[PDB]
Tab-separated table of C-alpha atoms and ligand atoms in Angstrom:
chain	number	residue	atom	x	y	z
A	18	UNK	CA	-15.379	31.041	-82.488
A	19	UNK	CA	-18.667	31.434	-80.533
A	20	UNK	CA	-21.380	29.936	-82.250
A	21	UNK	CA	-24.886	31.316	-81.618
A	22	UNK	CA	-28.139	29.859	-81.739
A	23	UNK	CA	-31.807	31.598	-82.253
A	24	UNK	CA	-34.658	29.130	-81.047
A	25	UNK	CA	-38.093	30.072	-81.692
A	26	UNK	CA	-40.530	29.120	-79.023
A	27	UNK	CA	-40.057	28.689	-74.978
A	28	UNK	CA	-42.507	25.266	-74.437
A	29	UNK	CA	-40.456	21.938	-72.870
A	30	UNK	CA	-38.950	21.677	-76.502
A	31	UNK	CA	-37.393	24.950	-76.857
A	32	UNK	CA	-36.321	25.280	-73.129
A	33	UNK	CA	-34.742	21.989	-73.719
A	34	UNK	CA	-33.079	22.768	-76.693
A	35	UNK	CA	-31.764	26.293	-74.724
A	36	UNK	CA	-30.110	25.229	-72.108
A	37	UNK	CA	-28.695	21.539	-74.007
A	38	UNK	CA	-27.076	24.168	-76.394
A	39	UNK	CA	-25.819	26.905	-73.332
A	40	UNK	CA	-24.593	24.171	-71.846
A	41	UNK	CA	-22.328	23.248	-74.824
A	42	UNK	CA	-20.949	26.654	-74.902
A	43	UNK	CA	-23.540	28.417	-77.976
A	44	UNK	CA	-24.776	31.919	-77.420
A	45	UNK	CA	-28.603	31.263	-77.766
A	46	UNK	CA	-31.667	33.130	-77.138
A	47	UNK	CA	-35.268	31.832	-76.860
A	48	UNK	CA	-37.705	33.678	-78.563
A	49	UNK	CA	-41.374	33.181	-76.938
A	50	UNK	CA	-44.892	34.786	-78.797
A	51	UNK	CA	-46.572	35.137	-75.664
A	52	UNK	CA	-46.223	38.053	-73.127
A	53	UNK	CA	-44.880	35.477	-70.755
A	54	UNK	CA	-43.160	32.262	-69.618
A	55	UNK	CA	-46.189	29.610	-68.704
A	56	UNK	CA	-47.097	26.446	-69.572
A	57	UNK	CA	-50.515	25.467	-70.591
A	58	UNK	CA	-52.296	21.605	-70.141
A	59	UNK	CA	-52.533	21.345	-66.087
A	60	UNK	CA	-50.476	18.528	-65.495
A	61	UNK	CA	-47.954	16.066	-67.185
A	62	UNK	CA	-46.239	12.796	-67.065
A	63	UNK	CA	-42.494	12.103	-67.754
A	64	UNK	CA	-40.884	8.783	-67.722
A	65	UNK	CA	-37.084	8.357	-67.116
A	66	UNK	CA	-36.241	8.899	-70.825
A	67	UNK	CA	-37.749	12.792	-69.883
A	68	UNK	CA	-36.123	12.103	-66.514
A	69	UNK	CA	-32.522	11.693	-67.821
A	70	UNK	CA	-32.921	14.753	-70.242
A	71	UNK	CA	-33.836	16.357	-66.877
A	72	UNK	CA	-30.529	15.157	-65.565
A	73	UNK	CA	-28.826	16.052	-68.523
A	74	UNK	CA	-29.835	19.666	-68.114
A	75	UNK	CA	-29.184	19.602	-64.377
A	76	UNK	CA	-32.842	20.381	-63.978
A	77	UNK	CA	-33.797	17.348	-62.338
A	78	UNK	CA	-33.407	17.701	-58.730
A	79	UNK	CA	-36.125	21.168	-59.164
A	80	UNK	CA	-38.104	18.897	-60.966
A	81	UNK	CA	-38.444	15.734	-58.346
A	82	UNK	CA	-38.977	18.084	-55.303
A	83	UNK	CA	-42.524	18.617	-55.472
A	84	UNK	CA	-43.573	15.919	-57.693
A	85	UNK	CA	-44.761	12.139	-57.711
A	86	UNK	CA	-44.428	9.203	-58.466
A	87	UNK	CA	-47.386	7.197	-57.831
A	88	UNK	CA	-46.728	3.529	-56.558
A	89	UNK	CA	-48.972	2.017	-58.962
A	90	UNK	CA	-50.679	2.915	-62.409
A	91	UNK	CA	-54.069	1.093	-62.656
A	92	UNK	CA	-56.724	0.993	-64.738
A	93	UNK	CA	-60.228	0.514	-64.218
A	94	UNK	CA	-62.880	-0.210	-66.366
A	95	UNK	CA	-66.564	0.493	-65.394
A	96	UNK	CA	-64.960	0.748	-62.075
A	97	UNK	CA	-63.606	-2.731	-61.754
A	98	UNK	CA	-59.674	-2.635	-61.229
A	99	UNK	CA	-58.327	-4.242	-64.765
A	100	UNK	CA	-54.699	-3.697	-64.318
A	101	UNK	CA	-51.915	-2.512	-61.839
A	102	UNK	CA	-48.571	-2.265	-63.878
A	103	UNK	CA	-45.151	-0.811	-62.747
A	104	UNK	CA	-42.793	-0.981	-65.410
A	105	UNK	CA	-40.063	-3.169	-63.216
A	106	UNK	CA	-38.575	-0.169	-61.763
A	107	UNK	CA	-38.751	1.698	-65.047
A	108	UNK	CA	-38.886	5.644	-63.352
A	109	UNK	CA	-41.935	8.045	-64.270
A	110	UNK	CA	-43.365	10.830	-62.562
A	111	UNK	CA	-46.341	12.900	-62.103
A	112	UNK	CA	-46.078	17.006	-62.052
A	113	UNK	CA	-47.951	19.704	-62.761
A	114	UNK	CA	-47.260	21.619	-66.188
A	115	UNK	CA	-45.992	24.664	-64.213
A	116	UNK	CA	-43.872	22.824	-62.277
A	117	UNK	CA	-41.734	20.782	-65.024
A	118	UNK	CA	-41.921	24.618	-66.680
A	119	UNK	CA	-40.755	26.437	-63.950
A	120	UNK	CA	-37.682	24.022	-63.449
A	121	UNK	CA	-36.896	24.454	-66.890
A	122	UNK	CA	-37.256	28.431	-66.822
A	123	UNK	CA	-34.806	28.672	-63.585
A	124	UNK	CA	-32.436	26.593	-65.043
A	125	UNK	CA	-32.199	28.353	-68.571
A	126	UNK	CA	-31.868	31.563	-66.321
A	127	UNK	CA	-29.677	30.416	-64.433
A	128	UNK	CA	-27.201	29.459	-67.169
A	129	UNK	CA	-27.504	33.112	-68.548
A	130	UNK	CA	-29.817	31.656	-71.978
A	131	UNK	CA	-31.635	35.327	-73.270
A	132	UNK	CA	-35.351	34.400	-73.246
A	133	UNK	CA	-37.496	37.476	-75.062
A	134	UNK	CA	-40.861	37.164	-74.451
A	135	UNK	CA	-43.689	38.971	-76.555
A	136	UNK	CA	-41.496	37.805	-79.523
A	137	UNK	CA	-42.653	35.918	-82.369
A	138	UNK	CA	-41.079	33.850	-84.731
A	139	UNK	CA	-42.790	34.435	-88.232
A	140	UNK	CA	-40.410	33.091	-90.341
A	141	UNK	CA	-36.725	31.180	-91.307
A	142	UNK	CA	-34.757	31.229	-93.464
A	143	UNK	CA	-32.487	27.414	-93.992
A	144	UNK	CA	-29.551	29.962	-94.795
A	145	UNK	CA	-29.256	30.890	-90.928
A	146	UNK	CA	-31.722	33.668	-90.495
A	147	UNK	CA	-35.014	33.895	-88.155
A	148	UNK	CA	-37.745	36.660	-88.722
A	149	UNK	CA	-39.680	37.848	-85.809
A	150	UNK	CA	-42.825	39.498	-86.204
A	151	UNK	CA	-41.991	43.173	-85.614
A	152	UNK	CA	-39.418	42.969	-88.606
A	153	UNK	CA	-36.424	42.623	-86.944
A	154	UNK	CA	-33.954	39.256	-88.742
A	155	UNK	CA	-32.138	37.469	-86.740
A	156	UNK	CA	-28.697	36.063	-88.266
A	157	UNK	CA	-27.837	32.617	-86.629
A	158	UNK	CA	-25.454	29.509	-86.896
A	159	UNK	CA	-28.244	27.264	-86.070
A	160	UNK	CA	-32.168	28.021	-85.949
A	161	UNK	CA	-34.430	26.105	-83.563
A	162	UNK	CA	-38.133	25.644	-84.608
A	163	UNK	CA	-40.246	24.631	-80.926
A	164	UNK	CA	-42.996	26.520	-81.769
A	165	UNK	CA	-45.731	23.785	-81.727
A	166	UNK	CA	-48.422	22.910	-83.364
A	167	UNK	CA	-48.933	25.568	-86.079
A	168	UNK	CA	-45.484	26.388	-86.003
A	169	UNK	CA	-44.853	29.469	-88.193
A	170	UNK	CA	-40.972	28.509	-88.628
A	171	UNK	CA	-41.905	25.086	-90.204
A	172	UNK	CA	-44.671	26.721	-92.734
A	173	UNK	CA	-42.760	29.186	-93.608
A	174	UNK	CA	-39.925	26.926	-95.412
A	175	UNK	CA	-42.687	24.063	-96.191
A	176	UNK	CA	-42.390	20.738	-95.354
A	177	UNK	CA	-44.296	17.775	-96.313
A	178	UNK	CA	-46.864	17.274	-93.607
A	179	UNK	CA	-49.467	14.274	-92.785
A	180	UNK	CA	-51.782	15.809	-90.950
A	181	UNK	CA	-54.729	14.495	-88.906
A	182	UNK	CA	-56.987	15.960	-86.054
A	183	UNK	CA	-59.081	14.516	-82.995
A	184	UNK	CA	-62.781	15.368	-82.924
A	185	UNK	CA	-62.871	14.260	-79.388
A	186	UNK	CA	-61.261	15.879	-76.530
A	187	UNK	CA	-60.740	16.417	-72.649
A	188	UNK	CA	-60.800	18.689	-69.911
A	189	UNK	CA	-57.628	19.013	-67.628
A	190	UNK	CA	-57.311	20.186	-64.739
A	191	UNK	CA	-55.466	20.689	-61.324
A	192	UNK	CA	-57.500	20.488	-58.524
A	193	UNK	CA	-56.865	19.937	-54.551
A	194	UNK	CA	-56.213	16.315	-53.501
A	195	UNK	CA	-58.847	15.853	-51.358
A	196	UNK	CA	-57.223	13.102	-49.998
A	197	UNK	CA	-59.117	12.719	-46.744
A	198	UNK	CA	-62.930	13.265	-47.919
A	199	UNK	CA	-61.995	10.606	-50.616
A	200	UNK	CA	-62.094	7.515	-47.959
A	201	UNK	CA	-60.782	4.637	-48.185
A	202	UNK	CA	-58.914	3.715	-51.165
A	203	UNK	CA	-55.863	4.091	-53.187
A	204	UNK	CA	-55.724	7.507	-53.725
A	205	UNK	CA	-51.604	7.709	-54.555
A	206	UNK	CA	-52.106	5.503	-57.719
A	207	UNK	CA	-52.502	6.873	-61.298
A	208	UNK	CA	-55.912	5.826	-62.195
A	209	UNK	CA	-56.947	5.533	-65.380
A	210	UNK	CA	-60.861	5.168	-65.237
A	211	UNK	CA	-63.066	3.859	-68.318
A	212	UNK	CA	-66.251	3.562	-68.970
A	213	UNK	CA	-68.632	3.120	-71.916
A	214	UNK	CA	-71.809	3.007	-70.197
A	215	UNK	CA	-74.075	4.627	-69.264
A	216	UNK	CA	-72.378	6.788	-71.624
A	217	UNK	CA	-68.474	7.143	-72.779
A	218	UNK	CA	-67.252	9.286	-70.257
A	219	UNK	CA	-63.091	8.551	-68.793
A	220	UNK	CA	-61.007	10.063	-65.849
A	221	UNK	CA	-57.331	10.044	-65.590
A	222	UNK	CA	-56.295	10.562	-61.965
A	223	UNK	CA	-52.970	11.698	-61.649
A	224	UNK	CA	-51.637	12.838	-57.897
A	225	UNK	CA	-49.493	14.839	-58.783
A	226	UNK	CA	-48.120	15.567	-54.649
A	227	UNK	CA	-49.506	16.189	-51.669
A	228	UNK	CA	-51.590	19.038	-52.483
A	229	UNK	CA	-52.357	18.927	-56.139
A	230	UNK	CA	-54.210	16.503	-58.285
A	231	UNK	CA	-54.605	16.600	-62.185
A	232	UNK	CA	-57.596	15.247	-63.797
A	233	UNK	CA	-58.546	14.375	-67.480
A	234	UNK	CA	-61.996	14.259	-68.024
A	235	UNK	CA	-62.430	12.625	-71.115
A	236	UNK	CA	-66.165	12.704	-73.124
A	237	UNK	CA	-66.630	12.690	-76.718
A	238	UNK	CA	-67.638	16.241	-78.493
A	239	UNK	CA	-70.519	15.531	-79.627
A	240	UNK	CA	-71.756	15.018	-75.482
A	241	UNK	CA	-73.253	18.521	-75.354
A	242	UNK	CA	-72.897	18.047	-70.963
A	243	UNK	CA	-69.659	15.856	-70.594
A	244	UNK	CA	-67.461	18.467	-72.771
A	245	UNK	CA	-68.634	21.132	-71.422
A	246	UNK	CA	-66.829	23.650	-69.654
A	247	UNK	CA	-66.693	24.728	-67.131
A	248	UNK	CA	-67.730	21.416	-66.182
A	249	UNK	CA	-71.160	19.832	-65.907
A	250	UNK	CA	-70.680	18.679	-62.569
A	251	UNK	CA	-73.980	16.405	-61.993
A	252	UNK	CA	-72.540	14.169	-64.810
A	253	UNK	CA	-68.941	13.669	-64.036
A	254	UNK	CA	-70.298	12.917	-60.127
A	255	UNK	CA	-73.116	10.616	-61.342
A	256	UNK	CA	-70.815	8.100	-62.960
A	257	UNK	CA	-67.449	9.043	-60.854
A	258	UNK	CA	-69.042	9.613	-57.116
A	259	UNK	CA	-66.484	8.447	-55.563
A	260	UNK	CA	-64.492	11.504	-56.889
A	261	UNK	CA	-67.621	14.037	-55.971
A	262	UNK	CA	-65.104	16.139	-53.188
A	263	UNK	CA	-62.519	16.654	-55.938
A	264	UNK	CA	-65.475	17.070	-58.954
A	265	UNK	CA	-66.910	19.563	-56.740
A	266	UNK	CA	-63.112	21.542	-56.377
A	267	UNK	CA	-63.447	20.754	-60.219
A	268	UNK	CA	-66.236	22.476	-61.111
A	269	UNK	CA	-65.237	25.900	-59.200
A	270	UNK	CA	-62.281	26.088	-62.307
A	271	UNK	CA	-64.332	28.720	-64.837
A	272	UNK	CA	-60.893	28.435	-66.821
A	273	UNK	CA	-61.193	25.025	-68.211
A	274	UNK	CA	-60.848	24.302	-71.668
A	275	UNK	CA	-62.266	21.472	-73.211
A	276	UNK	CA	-58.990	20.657	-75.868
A	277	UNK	CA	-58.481	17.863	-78.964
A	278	UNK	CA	-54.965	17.505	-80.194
A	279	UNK	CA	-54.098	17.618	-83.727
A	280	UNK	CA	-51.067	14.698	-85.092
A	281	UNK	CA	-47.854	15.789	-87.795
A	282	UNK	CA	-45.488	13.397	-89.185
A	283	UNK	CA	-43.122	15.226	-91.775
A	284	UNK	CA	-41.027	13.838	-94.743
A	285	UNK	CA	-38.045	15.840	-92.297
A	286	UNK	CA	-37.099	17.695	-89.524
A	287	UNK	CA	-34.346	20.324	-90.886
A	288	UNK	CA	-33.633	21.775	-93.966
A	289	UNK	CA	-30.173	23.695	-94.220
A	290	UNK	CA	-29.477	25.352	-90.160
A	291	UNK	CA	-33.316	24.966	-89.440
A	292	UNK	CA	-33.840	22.452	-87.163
A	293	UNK	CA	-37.768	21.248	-85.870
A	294	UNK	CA	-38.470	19.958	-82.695
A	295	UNK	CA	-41.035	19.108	-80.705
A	296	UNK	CA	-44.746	19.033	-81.831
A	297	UNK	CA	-43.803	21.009	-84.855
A	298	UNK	CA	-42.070	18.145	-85.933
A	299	UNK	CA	-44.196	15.706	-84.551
A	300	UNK	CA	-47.192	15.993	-82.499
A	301	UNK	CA	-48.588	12.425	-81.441
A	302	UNK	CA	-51.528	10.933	-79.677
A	303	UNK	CA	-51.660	11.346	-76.163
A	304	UNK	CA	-52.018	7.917	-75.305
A	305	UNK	CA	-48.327	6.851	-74.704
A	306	UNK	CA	-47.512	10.253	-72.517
A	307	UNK	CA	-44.625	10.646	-74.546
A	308	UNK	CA	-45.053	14.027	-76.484
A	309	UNK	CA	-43.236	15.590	-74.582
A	310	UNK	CA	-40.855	13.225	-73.687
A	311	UNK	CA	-39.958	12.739	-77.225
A	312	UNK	CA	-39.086	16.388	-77.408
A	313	UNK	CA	-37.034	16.676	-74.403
A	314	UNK	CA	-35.151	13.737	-75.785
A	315	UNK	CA	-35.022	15.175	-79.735
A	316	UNK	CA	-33.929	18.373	-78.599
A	317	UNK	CA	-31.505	17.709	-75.969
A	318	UNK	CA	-29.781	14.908	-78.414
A	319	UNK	CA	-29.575	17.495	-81.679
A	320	UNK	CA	-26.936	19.633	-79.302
A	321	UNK	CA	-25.400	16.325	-78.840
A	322	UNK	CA	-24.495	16.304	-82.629
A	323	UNK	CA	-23.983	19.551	-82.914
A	324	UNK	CA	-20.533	18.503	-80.827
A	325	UNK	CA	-19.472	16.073	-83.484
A	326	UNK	CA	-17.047	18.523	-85.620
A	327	UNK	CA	-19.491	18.377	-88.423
A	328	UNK	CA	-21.174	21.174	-90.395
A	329	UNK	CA	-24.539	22.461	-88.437
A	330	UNK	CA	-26.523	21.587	-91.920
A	331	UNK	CA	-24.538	18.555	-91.241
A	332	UNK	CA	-24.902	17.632	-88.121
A	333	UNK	CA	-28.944	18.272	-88.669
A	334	UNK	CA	-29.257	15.499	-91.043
A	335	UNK	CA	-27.112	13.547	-88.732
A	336	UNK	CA	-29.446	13.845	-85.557
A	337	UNK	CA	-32.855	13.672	-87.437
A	338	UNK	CA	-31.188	9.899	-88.554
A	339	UNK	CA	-30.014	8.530	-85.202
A	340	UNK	CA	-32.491	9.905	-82.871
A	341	UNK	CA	-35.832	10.057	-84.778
A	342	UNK	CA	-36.678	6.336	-85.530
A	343	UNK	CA	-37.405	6.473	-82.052
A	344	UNK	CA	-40.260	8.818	-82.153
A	345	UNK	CA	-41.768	7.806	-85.627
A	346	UNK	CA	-42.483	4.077	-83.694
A	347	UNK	CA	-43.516	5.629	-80.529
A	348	UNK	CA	-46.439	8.403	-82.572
A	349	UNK	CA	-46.950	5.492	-84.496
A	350	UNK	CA	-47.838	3.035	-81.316
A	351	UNK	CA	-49.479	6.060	-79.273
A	352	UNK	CA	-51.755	6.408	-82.733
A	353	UNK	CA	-52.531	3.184	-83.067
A	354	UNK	CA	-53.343	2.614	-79.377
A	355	UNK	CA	-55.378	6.385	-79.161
A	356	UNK	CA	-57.486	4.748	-82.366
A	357	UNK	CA	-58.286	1.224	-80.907
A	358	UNK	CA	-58.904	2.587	-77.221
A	359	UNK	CA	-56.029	-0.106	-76.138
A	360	UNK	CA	-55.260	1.241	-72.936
A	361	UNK	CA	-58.857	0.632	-71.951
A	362	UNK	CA	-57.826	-3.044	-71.624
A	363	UNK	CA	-55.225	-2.281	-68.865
A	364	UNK	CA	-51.934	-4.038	-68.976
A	365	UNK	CA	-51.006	-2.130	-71.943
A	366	UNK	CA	-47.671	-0.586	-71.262
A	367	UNK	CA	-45.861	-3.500	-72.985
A	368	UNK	CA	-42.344	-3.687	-73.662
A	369	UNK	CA	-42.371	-2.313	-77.208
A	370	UNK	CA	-45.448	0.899	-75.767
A	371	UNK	CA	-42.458	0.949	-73.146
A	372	UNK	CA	-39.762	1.691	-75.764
A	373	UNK	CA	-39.470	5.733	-76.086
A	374	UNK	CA	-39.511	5.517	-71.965
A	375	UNK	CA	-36.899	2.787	-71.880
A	376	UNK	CA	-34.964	4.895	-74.192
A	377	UNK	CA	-31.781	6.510	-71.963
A	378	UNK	CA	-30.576	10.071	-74.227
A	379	UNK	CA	-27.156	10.427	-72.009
A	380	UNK	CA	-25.403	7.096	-72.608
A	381	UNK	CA	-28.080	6.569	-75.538
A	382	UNK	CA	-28.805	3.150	-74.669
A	383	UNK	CA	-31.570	1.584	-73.738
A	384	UNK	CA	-32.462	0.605	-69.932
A	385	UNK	CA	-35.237	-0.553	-67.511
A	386	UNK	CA	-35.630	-3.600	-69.078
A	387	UNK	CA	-38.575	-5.323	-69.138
B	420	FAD	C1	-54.290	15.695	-73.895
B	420	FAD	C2	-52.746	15.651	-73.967
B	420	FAD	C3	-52.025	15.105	-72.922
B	420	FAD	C4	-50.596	15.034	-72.985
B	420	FAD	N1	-49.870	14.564	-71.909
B	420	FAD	C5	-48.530	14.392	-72.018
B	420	FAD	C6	-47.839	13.790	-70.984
B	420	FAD	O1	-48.446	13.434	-69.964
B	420	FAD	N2	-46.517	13.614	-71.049
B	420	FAD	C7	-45.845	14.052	-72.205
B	420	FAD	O2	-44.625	13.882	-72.307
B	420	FAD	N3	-46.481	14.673	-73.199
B	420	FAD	C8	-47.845	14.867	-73.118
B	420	FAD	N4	-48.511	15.530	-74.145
B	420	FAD	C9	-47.733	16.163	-75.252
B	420	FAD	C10	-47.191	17.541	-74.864
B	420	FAD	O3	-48.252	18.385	-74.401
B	420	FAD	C11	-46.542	18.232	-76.077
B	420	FAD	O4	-45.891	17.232	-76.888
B	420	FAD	C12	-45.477	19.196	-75.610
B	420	FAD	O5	-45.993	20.196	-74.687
B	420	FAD	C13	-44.939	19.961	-76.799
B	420	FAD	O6	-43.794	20.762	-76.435
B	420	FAD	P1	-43.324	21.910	-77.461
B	420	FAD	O7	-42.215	22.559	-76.780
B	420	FAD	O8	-42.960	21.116	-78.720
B	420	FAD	O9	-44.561	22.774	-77.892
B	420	FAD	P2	-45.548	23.699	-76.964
B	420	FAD	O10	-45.599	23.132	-75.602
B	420	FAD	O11	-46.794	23.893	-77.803
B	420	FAD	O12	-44.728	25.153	-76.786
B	420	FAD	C14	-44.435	25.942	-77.916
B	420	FAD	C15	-44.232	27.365	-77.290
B	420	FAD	O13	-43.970	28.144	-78.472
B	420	FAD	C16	-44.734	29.367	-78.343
B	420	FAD	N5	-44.933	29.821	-79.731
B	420	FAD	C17	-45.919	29.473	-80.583
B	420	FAD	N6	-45.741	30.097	-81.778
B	420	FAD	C18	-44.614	30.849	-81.617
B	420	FAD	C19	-43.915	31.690	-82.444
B	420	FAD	N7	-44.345	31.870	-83.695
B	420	FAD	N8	-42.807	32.306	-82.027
B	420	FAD	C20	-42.318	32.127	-80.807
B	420	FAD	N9	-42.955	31.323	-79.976
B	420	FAD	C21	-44.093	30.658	-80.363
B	420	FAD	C22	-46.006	28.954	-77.607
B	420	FAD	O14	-46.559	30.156	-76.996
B	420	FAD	C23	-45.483	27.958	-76.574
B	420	FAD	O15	-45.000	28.619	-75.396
B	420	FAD	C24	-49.923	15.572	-74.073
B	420	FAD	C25	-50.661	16.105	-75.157
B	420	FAD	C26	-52.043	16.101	-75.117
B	420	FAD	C27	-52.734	16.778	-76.354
């Protein structure tokens, strides 16, 4: 009677996908490569689509303790104020990555989900079987694939894959807020700060609460002192002064990576009891801050219908057709807008950039209209 579940990887997708299915009654355990639970990135922003998975997992309430939501996201370009835009109420929130991942962790514990760790996913089988790397197969009634970009489970059965990969990239970063050596100023807004001269260099300010601020320090690759790490402080302060207290907090971080991202759009997302979600489905431009979201929202609504009755191979093909429209437009829009440097122009979050956000995954409606 009990069906069980093996789900290869423990990022936001996979812890998602754990506890939506533990929830629901499966046996499941999360299988995570590294040698622990973390999250990597610094920080992250979640809209209320993310925010209703959240409540949907009954991880929510960890999750707004401790985080932010800023009472304005602005943009700026060559320091000028271009934008402030709210969303009409729409909800979004600022965190750091351990934070959301942390939330996520407890909860999964909490509902008794077996989480290995050292335990990697090399390959699976669409029959119901996952191979870690020490040998050891795993039989299943429904295989998860959230390990990422490069994700072993999806190469191993071969899908067909558009690839493409950014040459530029950006440092992130949590850093102290600073808030009093920053003056006067807004310095509870997101904002997003562009400039193309003197030289192409962007910061995204993110509060993320009262103590912690995440940056994104944007510069192309081939700027041999803007993407380097750790960071060239003289030229992020020369053409961001105002931010020189948190720059300098900045520059202490001998950990920062300077990171591009890499986009996948596949022909599907399951093939027999293999299910993909998250950026091994579809990885997307950052612009839209809705990676993530999307697969919070994909992998909490495929245990949705797995309660339908149906066949898990199924059911599968049933979720990948209702849910993932919603992503293809929103990569496609985050693409388009991470190509054509839209959000530079402020006032950008439009009703159809809005539409993954305004999407609501528990009465699977839209809201928060615009
Ligand atoms: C610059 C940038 C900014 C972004 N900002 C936002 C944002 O603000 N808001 C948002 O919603 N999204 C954002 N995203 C997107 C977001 O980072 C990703 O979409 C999201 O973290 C992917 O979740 P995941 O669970 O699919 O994969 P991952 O987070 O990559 O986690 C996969 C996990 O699987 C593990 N793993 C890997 N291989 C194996 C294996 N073989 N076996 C077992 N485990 C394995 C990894 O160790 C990792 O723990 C951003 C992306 C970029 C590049």
């Amino acid at each position: 009677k009990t069906r069980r579940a093996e789900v290869a990887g423990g990022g936001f997708a996979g812890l998602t996908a754990a506890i939506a299915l533990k929830q629901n009654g499966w046996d499941v355990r999360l299988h995570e490569k590294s040698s622990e639970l973390r999250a990597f990135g610094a920080g992250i922003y979640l809209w209320h689509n993310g925010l209703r998975v959240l409540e949907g997992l009954g991880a929510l309430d960890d999750v707004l303790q401790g985080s932010h939501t800023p009472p304005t996201y602005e943009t700026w370009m060559h320091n000028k104020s271009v934008s402030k835009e709210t969303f009409n109420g729409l909800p979004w929130r600022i965190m750091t990555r351990s934070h959301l991942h942390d939330a996520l962790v407890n909860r999964a514990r909490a509902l008794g989900v077996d989480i290995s760790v050292n335990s990697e996913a090399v390959a699976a089988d669409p029959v119901g079987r996952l191979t870690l790397q020490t040998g050891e197969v795993l039989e299943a009634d429904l295989i998860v694939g959230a390990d990422g970009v490069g994700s072993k489970v999806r190469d191993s059965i071969g899908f067909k894959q558009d690839r493409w990969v950014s040459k530029d990239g950006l440092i992130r970063l949590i850093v102290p807020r600073m808030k009093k050596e920053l003056g006067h100023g807004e310095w509870d807004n997101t904002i997003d700060m562009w400039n193309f001269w003197p030289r192409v260099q962007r910061i995204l300010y993110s509060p993320c609460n009262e103590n912690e601020l995440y940056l994104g320090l944007m510069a192309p690759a081939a700027d041999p002192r803007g993407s380097s790490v750790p960071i060239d402080l003289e030229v992020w302060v020369e053409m961001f002064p105002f931010l020189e207290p948190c720059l300098i907090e900045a520059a202490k971080l001998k950990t920062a990576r300077y990171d591009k991202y890499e986009t996948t759009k596949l022909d599907s997302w399951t093939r027999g009891k293999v299910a993909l979600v998250g950026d091994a489905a579809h990885a997307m431009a950052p612009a839209l801050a809705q990676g993530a979201g999307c697969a919070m929202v994909n992998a909490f609504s495929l245990s949705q219908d797995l309660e339908e009755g149906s066949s898990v191979e199924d059911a599968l093909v049933a979720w990948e057709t209702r849910i993932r429209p919603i992503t293809d437009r929103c990569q496609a829009l985050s693409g388009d807008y991470a190509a054509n440097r839209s959000l530079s122009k402020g006032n950008m979050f439009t009703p159809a950039a809005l539409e993954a956000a305004r999407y609501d995954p528990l009465r699977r409606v839209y809201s928060w209209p615009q």
